[PDB]
């Protein structure tokens, strides 16, 4: 999960086409590789507002805390018994 620790700013992907000579990916978008790293959401919002970029923010999705129990694999009467281990 160490790649899910920071905020990133990217841009909408523009057109990539086929080079007629080699079949390489030709682009005309200068911002196609511009990925920026921010410690918080507000730093990213402030950097985009300072630069006049229209932005949209997706909130951070954390995994919710699960309830784990190794003994639940061997319940007397619940469906959560493992058929094999």
């Amino acid at each position: 999960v160490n790649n899910t620790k920071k905020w990133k700013m990217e841009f909408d992907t523009r057109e990539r086409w086929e080079n007629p000579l080699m079949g390489w990916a030709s682009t005309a978008d200068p911002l196609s590789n511009l990925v920026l790293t921010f410690s918080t959401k507000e730093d990213a919002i402030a950097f985009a507002e300072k630069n006049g970029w229209s932005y949209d923010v997706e909130e951070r999705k954390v995994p919710k805390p699960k309830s784990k129990s190794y003994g639940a694999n061997f319940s007397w009467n619940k469906r959560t018994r493992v058929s094999t281990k």
Partner: protein
């Protein structure tokens, strides 16, 4: 008392160990079994648990956990789940053949132990998980169980005490790891005999998810004798925290390999010389003794001179008591080949569940197979030591410990023989 051994026949628990008397109910009642069982069952679970705690009985499976403290984990009010005693009758340990003799020749003593222990822990029934290779022993035990039901000793109103208690026998299907208690519990439930991770201990979640005590045949079968004869009687034998009698299985390079009952802290030299006829070629011909079956580290002849065969003295001898199965190896033994056959056993008997045993016991067997021929170099010895230390304590059950310990004992006491093996391989193959 300072010297131990020379046990009398009146102080034996396992009379009819040898099949010379009747094993059935007419013979077992004539030897003291099923006597005043009702008066034991009516004095309550706490009295029986106090007799087992007072007697200082430790787990005869081989870990030596205190049996009364273990069985008192079940002494708690129920919550709707049934409770179970499960008698570990697998006995897959190389060297060990005592529980076979208990089941085969004193079966009613085991059934009465099931009843007394299940009353002590509030258990509903007893599941005796016998080894499937012990087929005649299992039919033998089933005949004794039928005789106990036909006499009203177990079942509905067991011994006229108002306690309901069944005794079931489940046969195994050829896995040494199904003697480990949680893997045995999985094996009863219709699964691969793969051990569980503890916690939950079986007193919380055991067989079918119920409260369960898994206990050896010997530590169950001596419990009616402990309840009748008293806790102080059984605690008057052996050293302190080493109380009682013990079955010994002296096999290997002795003149008369045998099973014999003996007082707890008996000397190993006295045991081998007295009951087994001594080492073949004399006591000067002794090279090593595996004290308690294959999982215990071997001890050489310098250690075996003064060592006592209880738990703490063999712990001080950097081995274990284990099953008290004495495997005697004389000077004519390729000891590297014997320990490598033992590691071959431990990789055929390993359930493949967790990584360190599944990979490292095979890797130890490959290194030991090269050590037998000497096709190695001495830097691989300490390397193998570290491999054993990567398996010990990092596994789910103690078969990783039981496979790492013989390698450690062999390296620790016979590193020069390993090195001269490898250097003679080097000088005759290059």
């Amino acid at each position: 008392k300072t010297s131990f051994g020379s046990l009398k026949d009146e102080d034996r628990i396992f009379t009819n160990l040898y099949g010379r008397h009747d094993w059935r109910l007419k013979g077992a009642q004539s030897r003291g079994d099923w006597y005043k069982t009702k008066e034991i069952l009516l004095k309550g679970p706490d009295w029986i648990l106090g007799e087992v705690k007072t007697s200082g009985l430790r787990g005869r499976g081989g870990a030596g956990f205190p049996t009364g403290l273990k069985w008192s984990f079940m002494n708690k009010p129920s919550d709707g789940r049934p409770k179970y005693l499960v008698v570990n009758a697998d006995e897959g340990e190389p060297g060990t053949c005592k529980d076979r003799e208990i089941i085969r020749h004193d079966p009613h003593k085991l059934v009465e132990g099931c009843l007394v222990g299940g009353r002590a822990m509030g258990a509903r029934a007893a599941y005796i998980y016998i080894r499937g290779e012990f087929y005649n022993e299992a039919s033998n035990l089933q005949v004794a169980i039928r005789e106990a039901y036909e006499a009203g000793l177990i079942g509905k109103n067991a011994c006229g005490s108002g306690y309901d208690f069944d005794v079931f026998v489940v046969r195994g299907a050829g896995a040494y790891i199904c003697g480990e208690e949680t893997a045995l519990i999985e094996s009863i439930e219709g699964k691969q005999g793969k051990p569980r991770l503890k916690p939950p201990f079986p007193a919380d979640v055991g067989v079918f998810g119920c409260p369960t005590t898994v206990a050896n045949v010997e530590t169950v079968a001596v419990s009616p004798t402990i309840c009748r004869r008293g806790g102080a009687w059984f605690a008057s034998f052996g050293r302190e925290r080493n109380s009682g009698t013990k079955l010994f299985n002296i096999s290997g390079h002795v003149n008369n390999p045998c099973t014999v009952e003996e007082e707890m802290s008996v000397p190993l030299k006295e045991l081998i010389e007295k009951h087994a006829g001594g080492v073949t070629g004399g006591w000067d011909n002794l090279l090593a003794v595996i004290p308690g079956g294959s999982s215990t580290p071997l001890i050489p002849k310098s250690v075996c001179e003064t060592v006592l065969m209880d738990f703490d003295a063999l712990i001080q001898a950097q081995t274990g008591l284990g099953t008290a199965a004495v495997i005697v190896m004389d000077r004519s033994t390729d000891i590297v080949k014997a320990i490598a056959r033992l590691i071959e056993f431990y990789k055929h008997e390993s359930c493949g569940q967790c990584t360190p045993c599944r990979e490292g016991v095979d890797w130890m067997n490959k290194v030991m197979a090269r050590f037998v021929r000497g096709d190695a170099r001495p830097a691989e010895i300490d390397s193998l030591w570290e491999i054993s230390k990567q398996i010990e304590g990092h596994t789910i059950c103690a078969l990783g410990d039981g496979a790492a310990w013989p390698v450690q004992g062999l390296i620790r006491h016979f590193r020069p023989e390993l090195e001269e093996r490898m250097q003679r391989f080097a000088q005759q193959h290059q």
